[PDB]
Structure formats: C-alpha cells, structure tokens
C-alpha cells in the first residue's frame, strides 16, 4: 500500500516528465546540424543546451522544488543538470545499437560522434557501461522519474544552503521509490539498492565530464561553439 | 598615376576580402536553420556571428592593423564590426528582390525575416535605403574593400588609444581611394564624396542597431539565442 500523498507525488513526477520529454525528437532539426577538429560540438552543444531547458522545466514541477529559495534551485541545477541529462538520455539509449537513437540516422549518436565533440573514452567508457546497466534494470516509468527527482534533490551539493529542508524532500522521494518497488515491481527486492548505486556512478561520471568541459571551455576556439546557457550552467560562477 | 605602395595596398585589400568572403554561401547550411515570438533570431544570430569572424579575418590583413596594440584592434572591431557587416552585406543585396540573396530561397532574407529576429522598421527602414543607395554607386571591387578598410580604421571610436597612429592609417587609405577613383573610375568626380557620406549614414545605422541589440540582450529568453562571440563583441564590456 502506497499512501494517497505518495501516489500524488508519482502522478506529478510522471506528468512532469511527459511535458518535458518529446519522444518525437522533432525539435532536433533546429540544432546546428551534425557533422561527422571536433565536428560534432555545435550539434551536441545545442542538444545539451536544449536538454538543460527540459530539466529546468521538469525540476520546477517536482513537489516543493519551487518552494526552495531561488539560490538553492540554481545550486541544485548547476551541480545536478549533467547527471539528469545522462539519466534521461537512457530513454533514447539502445542496447542494440550502443548509441542514443533519436529518430533518424542523422540523430543517431555513436561513441565516435561524442569524441568528435571534445570528449574522450575516459568519459565515454564509463558512461556507456552506466547506460547499459541502467538499461538492464528495466525500470518502470515511475522509477525512472523518481530517480531523476531524487538525483536533483540531493543535499550534498556544493553551494546548497537549506541542507535540512531538501534532505527531507529527497527522503520523501526515496520512501516513495522503496514503497513503489516493493508493492508494484515484482521481483524488486534488490532494485532499490541497484538504483542507489546508479546515483553513485553518476557522481563519478559528473566529475569526469566536468574535467573535460573545463578543458573545452579554456580554449576559446571551442568554447565559442557552446551556447550561453551551457556556459552559464556548466560554468564555475558562484 | 597611383604609386607602387598604393597599388600594393589595393592588391592586399582585395585579396583579404576574397579570402574572407565566400560567394557560395555554402557554410550557411551550418547555422541553426531559418524559421519563418522572433523565429529568425537563431539563424540570424548565427549568420552575424559567422560574419564577425570573417571581418576579424579581413581586418588582420589590412596593412598595419596587425601592428596596432591588441587593445586598439579590439576597440576598432567592437565599434565598427556591425558597420562592416552592413557594408559587406551589400555584396548579396539585390535591388531586384529588396533582400539579401545568399543562394537558395531558404537563405533569401526579406525585411520581414529580419523583423522576426527582434529588429523594427526604425532600423530596417534606413538600412534598406542605405543598401540601395550603396548598390546604386556601382562600386568597383577596389572601392568596396577600401571603404570597408577606411570604416574599420576610424580613429573616432570609443576606447581607441593611439588616435594619432590610426588616423594616419586611415589617411593613407583615403588617399588611395581618391587616387583610385580619379584615375581608374571614369566619371567618378563626385564618387569620393558620396562614399564619405555612406560612412556617416553607417554611424546612424550603428546607433539604431546598438539600441535594438540592447533591448534584445536585456531579455534572457532572447539573449540566450545569441552566440558567445556576438555577446562579447556587441556587448558593452570595457
């Protein structure tokens, strides 16, 4: 049995994800096109930049995220945006292809496409293995969105002020996820622990990605290809 | 008779323009595409941003521009870039269409296309009349490039330090233009004065455009569509 306040939280996290994730990927025709010197940085910088707006949209509909001081909202988003991106991209990841497939061969991104955007196998080796292990978990829609919301509501991020308040938020989501799995996911006895482990790998992926973003953003010939929101969110301003 | 040092200056200004202006406009397929709410700001912001790199490329080959202190180079470029843009776009302007035609109906920009990028007829009314009057002058290639180089080498810009030095540069280009017209342009007796007038209208167009850029860049929903080089060059940092 989930409480009534528990399935409300699930109902509004699923709806929030549905409003901010467009399985047609038809907006992708508006990015600077893919070129396959780093030939994919314009298209991928545009793809991330767009995804960041979807994550901001999603975050504003998590129960009580809007209630946080506007400094906490920014602090949560600057540190967690890239992890939510990696999490949410699982929805287009394909085990058959070992690539993110977003409708059409021109929006099918192999590992190689991402190296032609600045990144190395030091980030792309763990990132793909994270993607397949998360794909293997075979999460329900309700679990996927719960995990993204738990990721965003982490108190242990640099620059958060109300440690007390948002730890309580994240506590309320973890209990929903534990109850949902046990009650609604048959054979889920170890699923909660595997999910928690996925959060930990995200911190390791974040760290590597931030390293590699730094080196991009320190070379103006590359950083001029980024967008203004990428530079403001992945940037190091306090 | 032009001196030998005079036709050298013409030879290297023409070559500089040819290396930085691609009449195939084939690079245009890499901008965020045109959409015809302001639907043309992504494509046009990309077009200007690319053009700014061409003008930086052109400027670095003007005789002795490279010899200036790197602060003067930046000062000259931040103030004059938009005028050189308006000047150089004359090459794709078409009196038949009243639009800039860059190869294909998808890169044919009417006045309307530019209003769907933030700008008003207060800038687009004088800008088009400047374009046709400059088109009517029927400038030789050597005159076009001389005028762009004279525009860039203006001492009377905010933030220039070596007023003496670059006034002498611009003096040396004006004398080339006067001699070129008289000697090589039949019936050019009034052409130099009309060209000088075109510089004056550029200051009036610059002023209006900077006004309208300010209002764009003060609204984050629009300014996030700009590129990093647009924001750094049209921006007001000293």
């Amino acid at each position: 049995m989930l409480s009534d306040e528990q399935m409300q939280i699930i109902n509004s996290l699923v709806e929030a994800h549905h409003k901010t994730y467009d399985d047609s990927y038809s907006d992708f025709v508006r990015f600077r096109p893919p070129v396959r010197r780093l030939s994919m940085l314009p298209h991928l910088a545009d793809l991330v930049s767009y995804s960041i707006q979807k994550v901001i949209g999603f975050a504003k509909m998590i129960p009580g995220f809007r209630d946080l001081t506007a400094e906490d909202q920014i602090a949560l988003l600057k540190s967690s945006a890239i992890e939510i991106i990696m999490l949410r991209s699982n929805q287009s990841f394909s085990l058959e292809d070992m690539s993110w497939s977003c409708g059409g061969p021109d929006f099918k991104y192999c590992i190689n496409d991402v190296t032609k955007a600045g990144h190395t196998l030091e980030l792309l080796e763990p990132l793909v293995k994270f993607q397949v292990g998360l794909k293997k978990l075979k999460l329900h829609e309700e679990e996927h969105v719960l995990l993204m919301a738990i990721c965003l509501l982490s108190p242990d991020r640099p620059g958060v002020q109300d440690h007390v308040r948002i730890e309580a938020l994240q506590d309320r989501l973890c209990d929903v996820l534990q109850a949902y799995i046990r009650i609604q996911h048959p054979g889920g006895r170890l699923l909660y622990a595997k999910m928690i482990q996925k959060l930990a790998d995200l911190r390791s992926l974040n760290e590597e990605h931030s390293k590699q973003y730094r080196s991009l953003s320190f070379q103006p010939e590359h950083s001029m290809q980024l967008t203004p929101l990428v530079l403001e969110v992945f940037g190091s301003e306090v | 008779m032009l001196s030998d040092e005079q036709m050298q200056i013409i030879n290297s200004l023409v070559e500089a323009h040819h290396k930085t202006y691609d009449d195939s406009y084939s690079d245009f397929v890499r901008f965020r595409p045109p959409v015809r709410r302001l639907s043309m700001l992504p494509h046009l912001a990309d077009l200007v941003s690319y053009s700014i790199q061409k003008v930086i490329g052109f400027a670095k080959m003007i005789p002795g521009f490279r010899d200036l202190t790197a602060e003067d180079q930046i000062a000259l470029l931040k103030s004059s870039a938009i005028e050189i843009i308006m000047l150089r776009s004359n090459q794709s302007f078409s009196l038949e269409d009243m639009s800039w035609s860059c190869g294909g109906p998808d890169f044919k920009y009417c006045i309307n296309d530019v209003t769907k990028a933030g700008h008003t007829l207060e800038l687009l009314e004088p800008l088009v009349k400047f374009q046709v009057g400059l088109k009517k002058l029927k400038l030789h290639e050597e005159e076009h490039v001389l005028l762009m180089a004279i525009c860039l080498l203006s001492p009377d810009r905010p933030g220039v330090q070596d007023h003496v030095r670059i006034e002498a540069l611009q003096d040396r280009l004006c004398d080339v233009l006067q001699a070129y017209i008289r000697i090589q342009h039949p019936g050019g007796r009034l052409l130099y004065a009309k060209m000088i007038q075109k510089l004056a209208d550029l200051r009036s167009l610059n002023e209006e455009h900077s006004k309208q850029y300010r209002s764009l860049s003060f609204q984050p929903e629009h300014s996030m569509q700009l590129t990093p080089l647009v924001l750094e060059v049209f921006g007001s940092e000293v």
Binding site: A70, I74, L229, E232, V233, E237, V238 | P220, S223
Partner: peptide, 10 residues
C-alpha cells in the same frame, strides 16, 4: 550571474 537561469526559473 545566472541571468538565464533566473529567467528560466520563472
């Protein structure tokens, strides 16, 4: 410093 993020946060 987060001019866009504030806008986006409504």
């Amino acid at each position: 410093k987060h001019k866009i993020l504030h806008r986006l946060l409504q």
